[PDB]
Amino acid sequence: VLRSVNSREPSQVIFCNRSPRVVLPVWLNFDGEPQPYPTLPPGTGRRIHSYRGHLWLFRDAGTHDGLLVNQTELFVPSLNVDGQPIFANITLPVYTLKERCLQVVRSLVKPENYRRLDIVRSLYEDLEDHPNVQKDLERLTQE
Amino acid sequence: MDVFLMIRRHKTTIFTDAKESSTVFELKRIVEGILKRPPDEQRLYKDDQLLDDGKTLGECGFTSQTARPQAPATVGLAFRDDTFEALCIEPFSSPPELPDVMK
Amino acid sequence: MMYVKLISSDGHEFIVKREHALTSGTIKAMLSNEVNFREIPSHVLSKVCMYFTYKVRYTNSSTEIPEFPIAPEIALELLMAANFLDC
Numbered sequence A: 001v002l003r004s005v006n007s008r009e010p011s012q013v014i015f016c017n018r019s020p021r022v023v024l025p026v027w028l029n030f031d032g033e034p035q036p037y038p039t040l041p042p043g044t045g046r047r048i049h050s051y052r053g054h055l056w057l058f059r060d061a062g063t064h065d066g067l068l069v070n071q072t073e074l075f076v077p078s079l080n081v082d083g084q085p086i087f088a089n090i091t092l093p094v095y096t097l098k099e100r101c102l103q104v105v106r107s108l109v110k111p112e113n114y115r116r117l118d119i120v121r122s123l124y125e126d127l128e129d130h131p132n133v134q135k136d137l138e139r140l141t142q143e
Numbered sequence B: 001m002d003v004f005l006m007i008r009r010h011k012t013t014i015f016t017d018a019k020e021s022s023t024v025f026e027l028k029r030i031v032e033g034i035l036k037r038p039p040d041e042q043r044l045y046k047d048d049q050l051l052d053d054g055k056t057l058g059e060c061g062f063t064s065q066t067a068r069p070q071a072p073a074t075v076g077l078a079f080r081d082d083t084f085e086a087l088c089i090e091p092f093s094s095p096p097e098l099p100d101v102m103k
Numbered sequence C: 001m002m003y004v005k006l007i008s009s010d011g012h013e014f015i016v017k018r019e020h021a022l023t024s025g026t027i028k029a030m031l032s033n034e035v036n037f038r039e040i041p042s043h044v045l046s047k048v049c050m051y052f053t054y055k056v057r058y059t060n061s062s063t064e065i066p067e068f069p070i071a072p073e074i075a076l077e078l079l080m081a082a083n084f085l086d087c
């Protein structure tokens, strides 16, 4: 389901990192493969050349922790109306406490040592389940 | 702007929000509904400095950028029935030492 | 504004709006107006009540959303709380 239309009609888009995370913007290419692009430092914005009907998602460049773009999971550059570039506002999502806790423990603990903590084997698994873009793309294909 | 607060007397901690331009007296009204002591029986401290009722919370340095939902600013409460008690805010628990593998 | 009392393992009485504590299903469950937590200490349950405020404020917000801060020393026990509370 998830791949960029090769519409061949360009669209001037502003990636606006409105998050404390270093952002990795990810174009879904014509085969539906996630192709990474140059990372945005936090609170910075760049005006980029993309195409209508193309598909974009954004992740933490260091942990692939999932971010939002204009409130939602996926971004599709529309037509620039009045020569006014379209805005991709990349914010942090309201992570669950469990997911935010996981992020923070992962960020401190080397993956090897996850097994070397005093927590239920249920939570080791939750720790090892690093956010994956591919697994998420797979997850999102279904109804 | 909105401001988010822990109003704290001894063990009791109270999470509440208000606007920067709301007053310290409106904050004493909040405690009245909850703890059933009138505003004249209360004394509000910012770090043990007594606060004037007439003053707005933005005047007292409780801004949106200090009193955040994720990191609310503490407000100390003292009750009266002859004189006002010493501010005694009982501290939260001590986090144990980091396991070797988080250091 | 209906409030609720969340007593921790060390007797700390946390008072939070009712509509902020039905963020946690586990609490939503226990209620559906004091609630004791024999296993959750106050240096944790403090931080949980901050999340509650954090979630009610920033969920469905067009505004920039800031990090939820978690200090290394609380991380392992706060995760175990998060999971028990379904939030």
Ligand SMILES: Cc1cc([C@H](C(=O)N2C[C@H](O)C[C@H]2C(=O)NOc2ccc(-c3scnc3C)cc2)C(C)C)on1
Pocket (backbone or CB within 6 Å): A006, A008, A015, A025, A027, A037, A038, A039, A040, A046, A048, A049, A050, A051, A054
């Ligand atoms: C015709 C046609 C052309 C294309 C692709 C293409 O040029 N694309 C795909 C997206 O629309 C962005 C744009 C791009 O890659 N433009 O160049 C950019 C270079 C850097 C950035 C970024 S993202 C963050 N930092 C920068 C500077 C953005 C665009 C080719 C890769 C095949 O698809 N149909």
